[PDB]
Design an enzyme around this catalytic site. Structure first.
Site, PDB file in Angstrom:
ATOM      1  N   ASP A  65       0.827  -1.194   0.000  1.00 23.50           N
ATOM      2  CA  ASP A  65       0.000   0.000   0.000  1.00 23.50           C
ATOM      3  C   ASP A  65       0.870   1.255   0.000  1.00 23.50           C
ATOM      4  OD1 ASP A  65      -2.210  -1.950   0.717  1.00 23.50           O
ATOM      5  OD2 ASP A  65      -1.110  -1.912   2.616  1.00 23.50           O
TER       6      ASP A  65
HETATM    7  C1  8Q1 Z   1       2.276   3.732  20.989  1.00 23.98           C
HETATM    8  C2  8Q1 Z   1       0.761   3.704  20.808  1.00 23.98           C
HETATM    9  C3  8Q1 Z   1       0.307   4.517  19.599  1.00 23.98           C
HETATM   10  C4  8Q1 Z   1      -1.168   4.291  19.282  1.00 23.98           C
HETATM   11  C5  8Q1 Z   1      -1.955   5.593  19.151  1.00 23.98           C
HETATM   12  C6  8Q1 Z   1      -2.086   6.059  17.704  1.00 23.98           C
HETATM   13  C7  8Q1 Z   1      -2.919   7.332  17.580  1.00 23.98           C
HETATM   14  C8  8Q1 Z   1      -2.845   7.943  16.183  1.00 23.98           C
HETATM   15  C9  8Q1 Z   1      -4.213   8.055  15.518  1.00 23.98           C
HETATM   16  C10 8Q1 Z   1      -4.187   8.965  14.293  1.00 23.98           C
HETATM   17  C11 8Q1 Z   1      -5.474   8.900  13.475  1.00 23.98           C
HETATM   18  C12 8Q1 Z   1      -5.397   9.814  12.255  1.00 23.98           C
HETATM   19  O1  8Q1 Z   1      -4.499  10.572  12.155  1.00 23.98           O
HETATM   20  S1  8Q1 Z   1      -6.665   9.767  10.957  1.00 23.98           S
HETATM   21  C13 8Q1 Z   1      -5.827   9.737   9.347  1.00 23.98           C
HETATM   22  C14 8Q1 Z   1      -6.358  10.827   8.423  1.00 23.98           C
HETATM   23  N1  8Q1 Z   1      -7.355  10.301   7.505  1.00 23.98           N
HETATM   24  C15 8Q1 Z   1      -7.044   9.287   6.512  1.00 23.98           C
HETATM   25  O2  8Q1 Z   1      -5.957   8.838   6.411  1.00 23.98           O
HETATM   26  C16 8Q1 Z   1      -8.138   8.785   5.578  1.00 23.98           C
HETATM   27  C17 8Q1 Z   1      -8.168   9.324   4.152  1.00 23.98           C
HETATM   28  N2  8Q1 Z   1      -7.092   8.745   3.372  1.00 23.98           N
HETATM   29  C18 8Q1 Z   1      -7.410   7.798   2.322  1.00 23.98           C
HETATM   30  O3  8Q1 Z   1      -8.544   7.529   2.112  1.00 23.98           O
HETATM   31  C19 8Q1 Z   1      -6.291   7.178   1.482  1.00 23.98           C
HETATM   32  O4  8Q1 Z   1      -6.776   6.932   0.192  1.00 23.98           O
HETATM   33  C20 8Q1 Z   1      -5.755   5.870   2.077  1.00 23.98           C
HETATM   34  C21 8Q1 Z   1      -6.899   4.951   2.495  1.00 23.98           C
HETATM   35  C22 8Q1 Z   1      -4.874   6.167   3.289  1.00 23.98           C
HETATM   36  C23 8Q1 Z   1      -4.937   5.151   1.007  1.00 23.98           C
HETATM   37  O5  8Q1 Z   1      -3.572   5.348   1.240  1.00 23.98           O
HETATM   38  P1  8Q1 Z   1      -2.521   4.978   0.027  1.00 23.98           P
HETATM   39  O6  8Q1 Z   1      -2.100   6.245  -0.675  1.00 23.98           O
HETATM   40  O7  8Q1 Z   1      -1.304   4.292   0.592  1.00 23.98           O
HETATM   41  O8  8Q1 Z   1      -3.201   4.056  -0.956  1.00 23.98           O
END
Ligand code: 8Q1
Ligand code: CDL
Ligand code: CDL
Ligand code: CDL
Ligand code: CDL
Ligand code: PLX
Ligand code: PLX
Ligand code: PLX
Lengths: 122, 347, 54, 49, 98, 115, 88, 175, 140
Positions: free
Chosen positions: G43
């Site tokens: 990915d």
């Molecule tokens: C040590 C413990 C740690 C645990 C805690 C972790 C907390 C962090 C949580 C953060 C949550 C966020 O930021 S939320 C992230 C922000 N939103 C998104 O990523 C969704 C929109 N992106 C898409 O739809 C893309 O098409 C995709 C599917 C990625 C395809 O990727 P590729 O281009 O590859 O194909």
């Protein structure tokens, strides 16, 4: 390593003991004094050259002061040097006199009775 | 730094040196050394930069170690004889400690490593002070205790100093490191003749100080610290480069210049003591110092290196500050050989 | 014809940090024109403290 | 000619020139008298004249 | 010589060895310098007390005085070194070579 | 001999008190009880990080001023000498130089803490 | 002296070494010309992680616009060669 | 032979010197120097130097407080070193300990000249003086003579102290 | 110390070749050890084992030079029945130089070492014969 600094009756910082007055002073036309004046004149010329002034004629009073100071110091330097050499000779002669057994007089033979080896050049 | 503060610091350095000179008690000589170091550390750091700080730190560490060894030698001498007068040490171990401490203070090999670094890290004025005035006190102490010198150790250090000074100077392009290696070699020459005739040591010190003062003043006047910067001086002040070339020839010991007088005298004195191999080796080694002096002369005054356009601007301005003792120092650095017998006034 | 004088290529022999460049000293750099090195980005961390709640 | 103060003016510093000349003259006279006294003392000590 | 004299001389030798062999921290070398001064103080005091050299009783105090100066000097330099590097490690003092 | 016995007794009593305090009560040590205290929370950094000294210059000056105490303590015995004028002159001179050092640092802003 | 004159072969070997250390890649089905999404089935986030490993290995940062273009080991090799100015 | 109290004190002196010369974190080096200062004070007290020992202890206590503050300011690390947390530090500490052991063994078991000279030991008590007179202490009189005999020493010491204040102010200016 | 040199010089020139070779080997080993100490101090070896290897190679080189020189000089003196002759010392010095060249595996180093070491050894023998002093006492 220090020959004359421990001499008895030596005043620490005199530069010219009284006994040095028993010696003839150097003449004012001493060639060493003339060389000291020449050194002063060269210093004056270099002083003119460094300051970017006419080398031979820029400051006549300055060259005169240079020459006079060099001659003035050189006179007393020559007096002290002469006195030190006189002291060395005096001490050497006194020591030779006081130790006749270390400086014996042995009769000298003439070359007619001394056999010298002959090495021919051929 | 305030001018009054700087004057007070210079006076404190000089008064510590004079306290070493005039003292009859070992504790007062040690106090003079301590005062000299205390006042001398800030002078090295007048112009603040990391290099000056590093040079000051290295100098302080070296001199503090030397002072501690100096005091240990004094205390051992007191233990083996209840004496404080600086006449002649009564224990060979204390003598070895004192000799090593004074060698570290003077920068003789193999304690030479700090000299080029400290000289490179400070300005030309601080370098002048470090390489001229800082040699008086340890040399005076060594002269006072000369009859207790172990000749083997002293001569080994002197020969090492001459060799290492030549070899280290062979590789330098910075002028301060060249001056420092010249200082090391000249100090080896000074200490080679110490166990035989201290008057020769005083004469060598005087000649070396005169030539070093002339060299450093000519380097301050033409504000250059590298070979290539000094290659530009001919296009602004040719007289300075000519005088510098003559002074460099004198520093190489070439007759009939002044620098020939000390070595000559030293050599003859050593031959009076059936020392023949060592003076021969010392002269053949000083050939190296002559070589890198001639390299500097080639780059500075005998050939003309390319210059820059901006130099034209400098043609329109003179020097606002003049050094009053530079011409006399140059003349003494060159034309005093005919006055050689005057050395009798030094004893 | 004229007398030979040093040029830039002749001059650069004396411009390095050291004579006789070896492999170890090839990476040595000449000191700054003024004896001033650029300051290091050695950022001094402050001390972070929890004042309260207890 | 010059557009600036030109510290060396059309006239030289008479104070400095006078001081320099006086210093030279005094040194020469002192040397003369000292040499005379030295000769006299040497003659008196060694019984020459 | 008593065994105490040998112990004090060995203490001085150990402090000198510790100063001459550098680890990273400059403060440790400064402490070695201070220890050398302390051993010198003890040695001189023991000699002067044993020989009943009365006027020399003021000698060790003078030693301490200049020790302080040296100590202060070192600390001053250390501050500046730290201010340049954020650390007192001696391996940062290598801008100058031989 | 008596002072050695007194020092040994005092150190022994303190050590015995520590031993009693550590061996008499019931101990229940777990990781949360023994964690460092920052009033509710885990410390962000280490307590071994550098901690800046704003009074460093005064700290250095304290070293030099601590030896004036050594120089001035034998004054009660020095007051018993026959040449009281020389002793008084030297003591007053030493105190005057100490006061001059204090004044010099005061006027050069050396007693102000670093910001 | 400093590190020896790094060449294309050593760069390629290091890239494949850190690529085979990745757990989501079959160690033998990987080739220098294999496309990450297509041949390896990875990915975008896997590709970003690979670029992080690249940055860790070769000791220099890679911006996002460039990393979006590195899509196979050979492209990574070319980018590293261009950044380090390596002709062979 | 008599309880060898001075020998034990000098041995602890050497042990403290080994402790701070192996160079752990400067906290423990300062602790070792404080221990050495106290024990050397005890030695000098046993030889009759009450004032000198007490003064050296006081001076080194003040200096070590300043050194502790400076260590916390500019000589710290994440994990400060102890004598057992490092192969180098532990090796130096052990080497110093066994070197002192070897020197002591070659001293009290036979007469051998290590560096300077040789001796047998026999405890310090032999080389005393049994002087029986006085309504004062000779140490106190000799120290108090500094204000009547040592005018030159007082002058140079005061000058050096004032210059040292000026010097530290000049050094720490920066800019 | 000078005790090693005195042990070397106490044996007569043309007698007891094994003892003289052993003494020269001791002198060479001490010189090599000092050289190794200075080299390690000023040029750190980046690891304990490499420092040990450097010390070993330096010390073995110097000890081999000393052994070869002493053995060759003693054997040449005793075979030729010519003690007090600088030729034996020259032969031993060239043998030591060839040993150094073989150690470093360099023909030019070997030849130059042969020449210079032979000259130095012959000069040392001449100084021993005529009483030349390196560190002269302050007689005047
Ligand atoms: C040590 C413990 C740690 C645990 C805690 C972790 C907390 C962090 C949580 C953060 C949550 C966020 O930021 S939320 C992230 C922000 N939103 C998104 O990523 C969704 C929109 N992106 C898409 O739809 C893309 O098409 C995709 C599917 C990625 C395809 O990727 P590729 O281009 O590859 O194909
Ligand atoms: C052994 C026995 C005794 C021997 C004596 C000793 C040797 C001689 C004396 C030495 C010292 C005296 C002079 C030195 C200071 C002069 C300064 C200077 O630069 O000169 C310029 C100056 C001319 O400049 P100017 O007039 O202002 O206008 C031109 C511009 O300035 C335009 O000028 P510029 O500056 O723009 O030109 C640039 C030039 C500027 O560069 C120079 O000018 C070189 C100056 C070098 C200084 C000398 C070093 C210091 C002294 C050491 C001497 C060592 C001697 C040992 C042997 C080694 C030789 C090197 O730079 C160059 O061209 C690069 C050249 C580099 C080549 C390498 C050679 C350089 C060194 C050679 C030195 C030779 C020794 C000195 C000889 C005399 C030189 C004047 O020359 C002079 O006029 C002075 C010469 C002497 C005149 C006075 C004589 C007295 C009058 C007659 C009375 C008769 C007396 C007896 C009475 C009897 C009754 C009748
Ligand atoms: C009767 C007496 C017998 C003879 C004894 C007296 C003669 C002494 C001869 C020793 C010559 C030393 C220099 C030669 C080469 C330098 C060493 C070196 O690393 O080259 C490696 C060279 C191989 O080349 P390389 O490994 O590729 O070089 C690496 C880099 O390219 C370049 O190499 P690097 O960059 O790695 O350099 C290493 C490093 C370090 O450089 C060194 O190794 C320094 C060596 C100095 C030690 C001098 C030995 C004298 C011993 C005195 C006591 C003798 C008691 C007996 O360089 C530095 O950091 C700078 C060195 C100079 C700076 C300042 C040093 C001064 C310190 C003090 C000097 C001496 C103080 C003595 C006492 C002082 C008290 C006042 O050669 C070797 O394999 C090592 C063996 C050397 C041959 C020794 C020959 C001895 C023969 C004795 C036979 C006896 C015959 C029987 C008698 C009857
Ligand atoms: C009154 C005046 C007298 C004053 C003096 C009296 C002194 C008495 C006090 C003695 C008590 C000790 C006091 C403690 C001081 C504090 C020490 C300290 O903090 O160390 C910091 C220092 C650096 O701290 P660091 O940064 O944390 O360490 C990082 C790594 O070490 C470095 O990182 P790396 O691992 O990457 O580096 C590679 C590796 C490199 O390591 C090496 O390459 C060294 C290995 C050489 C092996 C030698 C060959 C073995 C055979 C030779 C034996 C001779 C007889 C053989 C005869 C023929 C054989 C068949 O490490 C080194 O660089 C270390 C080099 C320095 C070695 C030790 C220095 C000694 C002089 C240098 C010459 C070395 C030996 C050459 C041969 C000389 C003749 C024996 O640590 C060390 O380097 C050594 C560890 C400390 C333990 C050794 C202390 C004992 C030596 C005391 C003085 C000598 C004896 C004293 C008197 C005895 C006779 C009178
Ligand atoms: C003032 C007026 C003018 C005078 C001044 C100017 C004239 C005089 C000076 C100029 C010439 C003298 C210079 C000396 C030669 C320098 C060679 C050199 O630098 O090597 C570096 C150079 C580079 O070193 P590298 O890079 O590490 O190694 C790469 C090699 O290229 C790779 O090499 P490779 O793998 O291809 O093969 C190397 C190998 C094999 O090389 C070969 O394939 C050819 C074999 C060469 C060995 C000897 C020649 C055999 C044929 C003739 C045999 C003798 C004939 C009769 C002699 C007695 C006459 C009655 O070499 C050996 O195995 C040598 C084994 C030693 C056995 C024989 C040693 C005898 C020495 C002296 C004999 C004569 C005494 C003088 C009698 C005078 C009568 C009055 O090495 C060479 O390439 C040449 C090595 C071969 C040595 C030839 C020397 C024979 C010439 C006589 C020398 C004796 C005079 C000097 C006195 C001090 C001697 C210790
Ligand atoms: C470059 C050539 C050298 C130049 C040297 C500097 C020249 C200017 C110096 C200013 C002159 C004043 C110096 C001294 C005058 C009065 C002080 C006098 O009382 O000191 C006496 C001493 O007199 C001086 O030392 C004489 C100084 C003369 C120096 C010049 C000799 C140079 C040698 C030859 C080179 C030619 C020089 C040409 C000059 C322009 C006391 O003797 P003493 O306290 O018991 O000896 C102490 C040392 N001891 C015990 C170890 C022996
Ligand atoms: C005010 C100043 C004066 C004070 C004077 C008294 C000083 C007291 C010093 C400290 C004692 C106070 C502690 C209270 C009783 C001691 C109990 C402890 O130290 O020993 C126990 C003994 O445990 C041992 O590990 C097992 C016993 C076996 C070892 C004994 C060796 C010899 C016995 C062999 C039997 C034959 C008899 C031989 C002797 C004659 C370990 O118990 P532990 O649970 O961990 O710790 C918690 C204790 N609690 C429960 C009270 C809170
Ligand atoms: C040559 C130029 C002179 C001025 C510049 C000189 C530079 C050096 C600084 C001062 C020179 C020091 C000379 C003083 C030496 C002290 C000894 C002498 O003066 O006698 C003392 C006389 O006492 C005087 O009062 C000395 C005190 C004078 C000094 C105090 C102030 C001057 C200091 C100025 C410089 C210091 C640094 C800067 C301070 C601002 C004590 O003798 P006395 O007690 O009878 O008998 C002792 C013998 N007994 C024990 C057997 C009985």
């Amino acid at each position: 390593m220090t020959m004359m600094s421990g001499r008895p009756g030596r005043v620490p910082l005199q530069f010219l003991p009284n006994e040095a007055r028993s010696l003839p002073p150097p003449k004012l036309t001493d060639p060493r004094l003339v060389y000291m004046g020449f050194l002063g004149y060269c210093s004056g010329l270099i002083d003119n050259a460094i300051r970017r002034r006419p080398v031979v004629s820029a400051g006549l009073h300055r060259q005169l002061l240079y020459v006079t100071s060099f001659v003035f110091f050189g006179y007393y330097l020559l007096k002290r040097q002469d006195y030190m050499y006189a002291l060395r000779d005096h001490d050497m002669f006194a020591y030779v006199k006081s130790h006749p057994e270390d400086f014996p007089e042995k009769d000298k033979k003439t070359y007619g009775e001394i056999l010298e080896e002959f090495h021919p050049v051929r | 730094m305030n001018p009054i503060i700087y004057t007070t610091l210079i006076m404190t350095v000089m008064s510590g040196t004079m306290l070493v000179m005039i003292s009859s008690h070992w504790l007062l000589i040690w106090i003079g050394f301590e005062m000299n170091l205390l006042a001398m550390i800030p002078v090295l750091m007048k112009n603040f930069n990391p290099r000056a700080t590093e040079a000051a730190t290295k100098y302080f560490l070296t001199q503090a170690t030397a002072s501690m060894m100096l005091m240990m030698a004094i205390i051992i001498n007191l233990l083996y004889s209840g004496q404080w007068t600086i006449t002649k040490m009564f224990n060979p171990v204390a003598m070895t400690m004192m000799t090593m401490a004074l060698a570290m203070k003077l920068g003789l090999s193999p304690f030479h490593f700090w000299v080029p670094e400290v000289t490179q890290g400070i300005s030309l004025q601080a370098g002048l002070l470090l390489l001229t005035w800082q040699k008086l006190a340890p040399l005076s102490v060594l002269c006072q205790i000369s009859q207790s010198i172990n000749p083997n150790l002293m001569l080994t250090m002197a020969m090492l100093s001459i060799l290492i000074g030549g070899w280290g100077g062979l590789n330098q392009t910075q002028l301060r490191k060249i001056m420092a290696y010249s200082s090391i070699a000249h100090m080896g020459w000074m200490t080679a003749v110490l166990p035989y005739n201290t008057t020769m040591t005083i004469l060598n010190l005087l000649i070396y100080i005169t030539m070093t003062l002339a060299m450093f003043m000519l380097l301050i006047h033409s504000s250059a610290t590298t070979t290539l910067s000094l290659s530009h001086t001919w296009n602004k002040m040719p007289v300075i480069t000519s005088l510098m070339m003559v002074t460099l020839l004198s520093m190489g010991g070439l007759p009939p210049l002044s620098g020939f007088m000390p070595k000559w005298m030293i050599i003859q004195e050593m031959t009076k003591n059936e020392s023949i191999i060592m003076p021969t080796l010392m002269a053949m080694t000083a050939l190296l110092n002559l070589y890198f002096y001639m390299r500097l002369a080639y780059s500075s005054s005998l050939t003309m290196f390319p210059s820059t356009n901006n130099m034209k601007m400098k043609w329109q301005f003179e020097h606002t500050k003049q050094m009053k003792l530079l011409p006399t120092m140059i003349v003494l650095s060159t034309l005093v050989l005919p006055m050689t017998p005057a050395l009798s006034s030094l004893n | 014809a004229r007398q030979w004088q040093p040029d830039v290529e002749w001059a650069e022999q004396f411009g390095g940090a050291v004579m006789y460049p070896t492999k170890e000293t090839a990476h040595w750099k000449p000191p700054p024109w003024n004896d001033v090195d650029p300051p290091k980005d050695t950022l001094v961390s402050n001390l972070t403290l929890n004042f309260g709640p207890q | 000619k010059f557009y600036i103060r030109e510290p060396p003016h059309g006239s030289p510093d008479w104070l400095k020139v006078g001081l320099t000349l006086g210093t030279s003259v005094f040194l020469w006279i002192y040397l003369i008298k000292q040499h005379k006294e030295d000769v006299l003392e040497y003659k008196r000590r060694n019984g020459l004249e | 010589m008593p065994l105490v004299y040998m112990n004090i001389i060995m203490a001085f030798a150990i402090a000198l060895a510790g100063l001459l062999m550098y680890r990273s921290h400059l403060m440790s070398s400064l402490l070695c310098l201070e220890g050398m001064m302390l051993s010198l103080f003890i040695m001189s005091t023991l000699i002067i007390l044993n020989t009943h050299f009365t006027l020399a009783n003021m000698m060790p105090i003078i030693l301490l005085v200049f020790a302080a100066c040296e100590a202060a000097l070192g600390l001053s330099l250390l501050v500046m070194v730290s201010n340049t590097y954020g650390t007192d490690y001696v391996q940062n003092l290598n801008l100058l070579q031989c | 001999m008596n002072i050695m016995l007194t020092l040994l007794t005092n150190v022994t009593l303190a050590s015995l008190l520590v031993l009693i305090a550590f061996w008499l009560p019931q101990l229940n040590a777990y990781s949360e009880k023994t964690s460092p205290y920052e009033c509710g929370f885990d410390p962000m950094g280490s307590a071994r990080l550098p901690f800046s000294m704003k009074f460093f210059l005064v700290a250095i000056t304290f070293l030099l001023f601590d030896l004036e105490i050594a120089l001035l303590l034998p004054l009660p015995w020095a007051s018993q000498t026959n040449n009281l004028k020389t002793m008084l002159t030297m003591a007053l001179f030493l105190l005057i130089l100490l006061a001059a050092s204090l004044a010099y640092e005061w006027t050069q802003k050396g007693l102000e803490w670093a910001e | 002296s400093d590190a020896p004159p790094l060449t294309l072969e050593a760069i390629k070997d290091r890239v494949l070494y850190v690529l085979k250390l990745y757990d989501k890649i079959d160690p033998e089905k990987l080739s220098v010309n294999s496309h990450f999404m297509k041949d390896l089935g990875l990915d975008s986030l896997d590709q970003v992680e690979i670029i992080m490993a690249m940055e860790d290995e070769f000791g220099f940062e890679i911006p996002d616009i460039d990393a979006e273009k590195l899509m196979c080991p050979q492209e990574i090799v070319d980018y590293i060669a261009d950044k380090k100015d390596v002709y062979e | 032979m008599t309880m060898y109290i001075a020998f034990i004190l000098s041995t602890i002196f050497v042990i403290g010197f080994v402790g701070f010369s192996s160079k752990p974190s400067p906290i423990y080096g300062g602790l070792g120097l404080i221990v050495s200062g106290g024990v050397g004070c005890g030695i000098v007290l046993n030889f009759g130097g009450s004032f000198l020992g007490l003064m050296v202890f006081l001076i080194y206590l003040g200096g070590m407080l300043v050194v502790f503050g400076y260590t916390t300011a500019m000589a710290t690390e994440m994990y400060p070193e102890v004598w057992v947390s490092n192969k180098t530090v532990f090796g130096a500490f052990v080497s110093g300990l066994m070197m002192e052991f070897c020197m002591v063994y070659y001293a009290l078991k036979e007469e051998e000249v290590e560096i300077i000279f040789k001796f047998n030991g026999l405890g310090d008590w032999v080389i005393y003086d049994t002087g029986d007179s006085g309504f004062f202490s000779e140490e106190a009189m000799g120290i108090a003579a500094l204000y009547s005999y040592g005018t030159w020493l007082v002058i140079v010491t005061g000058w050096s102290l004032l210059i040292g204040v000026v010097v530290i102010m000049e050094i720490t200016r920066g800019n | 110390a000078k005790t090693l040199l005195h042990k070397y010089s106490d044996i007569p020139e043309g007698t007891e070749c094994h003892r003289k070779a052993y003494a020269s080997t001791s002198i060479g080993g001490a010189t090599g050890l000092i050289v190794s100490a200075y080299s390690i101090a000023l040029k750190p070896p980046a690891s304990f084992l490499e420092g040990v290897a450097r010390t070993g190679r330096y010390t073995f080189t110097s000890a081999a030079i000393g052994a070869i020189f002493g053995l060759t000089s003693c054997i040449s003196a005793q075979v030729r029945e010519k003690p007090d002759d600088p030729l034996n010392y020259f032969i031993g010095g060239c043998a030591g130089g060839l040993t150094l060249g073989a150690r470093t595996r360099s023909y030019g180093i070997g030849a130059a070492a042969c020449a210079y070491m032979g000259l130095t050894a012959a000069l040392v023998k001449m100084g021993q014969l005529e009483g030349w002093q390196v560190f002269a006492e302050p007689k005047v």
